[PDB]
Enzyme design. Structure first.
Site, PDB file in Angstrom:
ATOM      1  N   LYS A 157      49.523  36.113  33.138  1.00  0.00           N
ATOM      2  CA  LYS A 157      48.299  35.825  33.880  1.00  0.00           C
ATOM      3  C   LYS A 157      48.561  34.953  35.096  1.00  0.00           C
ATOM      4  CE  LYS A 157      43.616  34.102  32.995  1.00  0.00           C
ATOM      5  NZ  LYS A 157      43.313  33.349  34.235  1.00  0.00           N
ATOM      6  N   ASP A 186      31.828  33.255  35.148  1.00  0.00           N
ATOM      7  CA  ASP A 186      33.110  33.084  35.807  1.00  0.00           C
ATOM      8  C   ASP A 186      33.475  34.356  36.562  1.00  0.00           C
ATOM      9  OD1 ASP A 186      35.547  31.452  36.258  1.00  0.00           O
ATOM     10  OD2 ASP A 186      36.536  33.003  35.073  1.00  0.00           O
ATOM     11  N   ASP A 223      34.960  28.253  40.028  1.00  0.00           N
ATOM     12  CA  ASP A 223      34.846  29.695  39.771  1.00  0.00           C
ATOM     13  C   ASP A 223      33.979  29.873  38.526  1.00  0.00           C
ATOM     14  OD1 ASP A 223      35.093  32.478  39.821  1.00  0.00           O
ATOM     15  OD2 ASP A 223      37.198  32.498  39.293  1.00  0.00           O
TER      16      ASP A 223
END
Ligand SMILES: Nc1ccn([C@@H]2O[C@H](COP(=O)(O)OP(=O)(O)OP(=O)(O)O)C[C@H]2O)c(=O)n1
Ligand SMILES: [Mg+2]
Length: 977
Positions: A758, A689, A898
DNA sequence: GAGAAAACCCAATTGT
RNA sequence: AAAGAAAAC
DNA sequence: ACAATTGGGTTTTCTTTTC
């Protein structure tokens, strides 16, 4: 534009083409011919359709009659009418193929005959018959020769289609005969469009009441089948009478399918009805879409395209099979075109009014026909004939909706009968054979059912219109990537399935993701009762999902299955079967394995343990060396998790991804006790990732040195990690305020973490508001059970503050690019045009926003969506480049956006490919190409002077790149790790 | 057949 | 279609 | 200007909608 009935009659006449019996359509044209207003508002395409149908029949007299009606009322002949006339002369032999009239009249009038043979879509047999009838006079005519297939010569896609190179195209582990019989199984599965799966609910030892309920249910089902057949016959007779009374009717739409099949449809839809049943409109739309799905398959059986697909697929499997060889190795769509491909010829969907009327008619048929006796508990001789389904309205909502409820006795019969069988449709289940290659926007994925190229809601057609009107070589790489994501062979892990089924059938474990049974809900009085019903409903809604997914896992247990893939409008690729795929929860990813495995090699077990440490969630900020050291330290817990998953110290339950961690502990324990760990076949996907991917792409467009150093585009011994920096800053601010007695700052100790900030820090570069960040932080604080729930709200307001203290020294050129993109989208939408662009791999992207009720673009939605959609299109282009250059080297590659998955042996190779296909992607002047594309697209009109001048000086005010070398990303270790 | 949980936000867009 | 939840990037 | 609307983006799924 066209009227509702005028669009409706065209579907009627095409439907009469579809099931023959065409004199009812001819009769309806005659009834319109009787009154001059009745044939008014009739388009020319309906005349062309009925002429082409009579051409298929071979009746010249009716053809001439329809011709006479065409010259009547001012209509003009067009190319399809001459095609129908030449087809009639092809079936017949009289006049020796129009020596005297038709082709001479066409040549005199001036319509081109090459356009007749090429431009308008005809089937192969009709093309052959018109070709023969043309060859009757001037036989020296030949069709224009078929050109060799075009090859894309784009600079990013040059290497994938260059023959002068070394290619290693992988092959499946399955022999050609086994692949052929699995193709036969999938074909038989799709022909009978639904699949029966044994439910993984706890099997009960049967009792006398179970037999009595099942016998009663079988007798009721037989009576319902007879009643539905009688109702369908009465409906078909009355609608045929309506056609013979010269008005529109849906009678050929019922004549599409057999009466057996429609009654079986209605019964199986009744079977899967909810206990508190579904609304009228959703059920009607489901009935019509299901009718169309069966009609396409039936049309392919009758038309003979199934045998053509069978022959072509048996020739096609030589490329994929282990024990077969192709003379020149090619890509799957290239081999699909090298073997001369049939026309797909799948039917275009009906107009929405026809679909809605068909659904409501079928639903009202099911409501009216099926009935039961009133009382089962008391078996009296006189029982009331009571309906099974009821139409009720809903009072709570603003707009009242119809709801179909089961009769309350039927619920207890379904509970006591306890049928062990669930039923799925064929497109919601993984394929049992490799999927068809994506050769066009129209062809690919499933065998007989049509699949979109771009996932769109509410039937938006501008995406598909952009994909059709592009140059054909532009989509090739995209198509290739989708085919590459379809050809991965999957299988179900058995040990994880047994453990999850043990927890599921027994007392469920909600900590581990397994839902608990309908019992064990907790149990001022009205408040408590409402809370118990709410939590019980949530438990039941989760366990239904788990039942469907675990039933498909149980069905696919001893099988090898495939997941065909799709795109959304941006370029991002999702698998088509929804219930059980690798873009799902923890249990879904733990159950799934590659069906083909590769030996570990020198770096297989190394990356396997790195993957395990990444799964446990501990040691995120460390280098890979300390990930290895941590894996080697906790090996006893790994082995105890693998050996005794539920009767041991249960260390894997402490992992961040616990079921995937258990699967990787099983794989590691199998690798370490093997005699040769290096030559061990592993089937478990290892993940890589990228860190802060949207910020990575902003940094690559801007070439910002500090930005590229921030998101690991510049190499370092340790990972760089933005969210743990912002968390540290907010923790400093919190300690400062809590020393001053701020109560909201006081009650947050130990509660500011990466996970809290985040999404907000990720999202400030996509133009988040403070309100959206507040909901993000609220949902992250509600998940922490230790935190006081009375002080969540104020904490959220304290945490949108001090996080939006990123004003200076945080992402300067990133927000410059963001501001330029947002102003560009705002000024494009201000003139009234939606934002369009082209992916660097050639895929056109348009934004389907247009909140008008859809006439004018929604400027707020367009400008808020343009930065994320543009960066997501770029990362999809990155993914597709990486996938294609991994296919050229022999890698089994699937992507979770991703997140790139492969075998543990190929991880380093994929990493290399990943970095290369980033460097080649952003070496292109993406900002400059986008700016000049938008100037060409939106600033080339002479009518608007000042608006185009303002938008042009906005678009040409592109942010300048910084000073960062993209090749150094090839040296980066934590770019994708 | 027929009423205190409580949602609390707060500044850029949009039909009027 | 609206509401109660859940999951992925 | 005035009051209502809205809230960075995408994908999937379930049983209930008067108590
Ligand atoms: N609510 C959202 C919106 C967008 N994305 C997009 O997916 C990209 C990466 O997915 P993540 O799993 O969130 O990984 P990162 O942002 O890179 O964070 P991390 O360093 O932990 O991997 C970022 C972003 O462009 C996302 O995951 N979640
Ligand atoms: Mg990531």
């Amino acid at each position: 534009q066209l009227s509702g009935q005028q669009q409706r009659l065209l579907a009627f006449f095409k439907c009469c083409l579809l099931t023959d019996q065409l004199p009812l359509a001819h009769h309806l044209l005659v009834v319109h011919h009787g009154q001059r207003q009745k044939r008014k508002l009739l388009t020319l395409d309906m005349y062309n359709a009925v002429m082409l149908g009579w051409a298929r029949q071979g009746a010249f007299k009716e053809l001439v009659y329809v011709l006479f009606m065409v010259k009547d009322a001012g209509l003009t002949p067009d190319l399809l009418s001459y095609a129908a006339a030449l087809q009639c002369m092809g079936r017949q032999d009289q006049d020796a193929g129009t020596i005297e009239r038709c082709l001479e009249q066409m040549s005199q009038e001036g319509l081109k005959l090459q356009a007749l043979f090429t431009a308008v879509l005809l089937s192969e047999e009709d093309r052959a018959t018109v070709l023969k009838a043309v060859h009757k006079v001037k036989p020296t005519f030949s069709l224009p020769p078929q050109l060799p297939p075009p090859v894309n010569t784009s600079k990013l896609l040059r290497d994938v289609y260059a023959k002068d190179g070394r290619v290693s195209y992988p092959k499946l582990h399955l022999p050609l005969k086994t692949l052929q019989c699995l193709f036969e199984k999938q074909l038989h599965m799709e022909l009978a469009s639904r699949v029966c799966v044994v439910s993984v609910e706890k099997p009960t030892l049967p009792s006398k009441e179970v037999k009595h309920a099942r016998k009663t249910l079988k007798t009721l089902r037989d009576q319902w089948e007879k009643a539905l057949c009688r109702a369908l016959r009465e409906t078909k007779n009355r609608l045929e009478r309506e056609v013979y009374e010269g008005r529109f009717s849906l009678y050929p739409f019922l004549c599409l399918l057999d009466e057996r099949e429609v009654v079986r449809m209605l019964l199986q839809v009744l079977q899967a009805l909810p206990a508190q049943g579904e609304s009228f409109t959703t059920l009607a739309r489901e009935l019509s879409a299901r009718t169309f799905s069966r009609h396409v398959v039936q049309r392919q059986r009758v038309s003979g395209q199934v045998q053509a697909l069978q022959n072509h697929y048996r020739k096609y499997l030589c490329l994929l099979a282990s024990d077969a060889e192709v003379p020149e190795p090619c890509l799957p769509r290239q081999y699909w075109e090298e073997l001369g491909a049939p026309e797909a010829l799948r039917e275009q969907p009906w107009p929405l009014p026809v679909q809605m009327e068909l659904g409501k008619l079928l639903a009202e048929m099911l409501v009216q026909a099926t009935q039961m006796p009133c009382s089962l508990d008391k078996p009296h001789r006189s029982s009331r004939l009571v309906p099974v389904l009821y139409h009720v309205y809903s009072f709570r909502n603003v707009q009242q909706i119809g709801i179909l409820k089961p009769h309350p006795a039927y619920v207890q019969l379904l509970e006591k009968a306890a049928e062990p069988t669930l039923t799925f449709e064929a497109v919601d289940v993984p394929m049992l054979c490799p999927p068809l290659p994506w050769t066009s926007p129209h062809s690919g994925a499933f065998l007989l059912s049509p699949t979109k190229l771009m996932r769109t809601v509410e039937g938006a057609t501008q995406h598909q219109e952009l994909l059709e009107t592009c140059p054909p070589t532009a989509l090739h790489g995209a198509l290739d990537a989708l085919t590459q994501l379809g050809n991965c062979a999957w299988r179900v892990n058995g040990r994880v399935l047994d453990l999850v089924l043990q927890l599921f059938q027994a007392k469920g474990c909600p900590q581990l993701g397994v839902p608990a049974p309908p019992s064990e809900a907790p149990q001022e009085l009205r408040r408590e009762l409402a809370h118990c019903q709410k939590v019980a409903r949530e438990m039941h809604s989760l366990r239904a999902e788990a039942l469907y997914r675990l039933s498909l896992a149980q069905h696919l247990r001893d099988r090898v299955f495939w997941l065909p893939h799709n795109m959304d409008f941006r370029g991002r690729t999702y698998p088509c079967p929804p219930h059980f795929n690798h873009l799902g929860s923890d249990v879904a990813r733990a159950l799934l394995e590659f069906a083909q495995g590769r030996p570990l090699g020198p770096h297989g077990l190394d990356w396997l343990k790195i993957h395990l440490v990444n799964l446990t969630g501990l040691k995120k900020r460390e280098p890979l060396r300390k990930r290895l050291a941590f894996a080697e330290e906790v090996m006893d817990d790994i082995l105890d998790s693998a050996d005794q998953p539920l009767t041991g110290r249960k260390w894997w339950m402490g992992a961040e991804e616990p079921w995937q961690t258990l699967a990787c502990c099983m794989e590691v324990a199998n690798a370490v006790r093997a005699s040769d760990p290096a030559a061990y076949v592993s089937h478990l996907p290892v993940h890589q990732d990228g860190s802060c991917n949207g910020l990575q792409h902003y940094a690559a467009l801007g070439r910002d040195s500090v930005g590229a150093a921030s998101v690991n585009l510049e190499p370092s011994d340790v990972p760089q990690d933005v969210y743990s920096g912002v968390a540290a800053q907010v923790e400093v601010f919190r300690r400062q305020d809590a020393q001053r007695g701020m109560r909201v700052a006081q009650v947050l100790e130990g509660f500011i973490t990466r996970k809290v900030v985040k999404q907000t820090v990720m999202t400030v570069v996509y133009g988040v508001t403070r309100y959206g960040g507040r909901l993000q932080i609220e949902k992250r604080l509600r998940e922490l059970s230790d935190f006081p729930q009375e002080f969540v709200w104020e904490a959220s307001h304290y945490l949108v503050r001090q996080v939006f203290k990123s004003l200076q020294e945080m992402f300067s050129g990133t927000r410059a690019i963001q501001h330029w993109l947002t102003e560009s989208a705002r000024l494009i939408s201000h003139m009234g045009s939606v934002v369009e662009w082209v992916t660097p791999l050639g895929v056109p992207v348009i934004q389907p926003y247009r909140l008008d009720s859809s006439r004018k673009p929604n400027t707020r939605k367009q400008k808020n969506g343009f930065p994320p959609n543009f960066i997501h299109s770029l990362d999809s282009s990155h993914m597709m480049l990486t996938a294609l250059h991994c296919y050229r080297k022999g890698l089994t590659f699937v992507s979770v956006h991703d997140c790139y998955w492969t075998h543990a042996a190929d991880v380093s190779v994929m990493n290399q490919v990943c970095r290369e296909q980033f460097v080649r992607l952003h070496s292109e002047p993406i900002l400059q190409d986008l700016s000049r594309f938008l100037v060409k697209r939106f600033c080339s009109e002479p009518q608007k002077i000042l608006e185009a001048s303002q938008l042009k000086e906005t678009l040409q005010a592109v942010p300048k790149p910084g000073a960062f070398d993209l090749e150094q990303v090839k040296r980066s270790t934590y770019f994708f790790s």
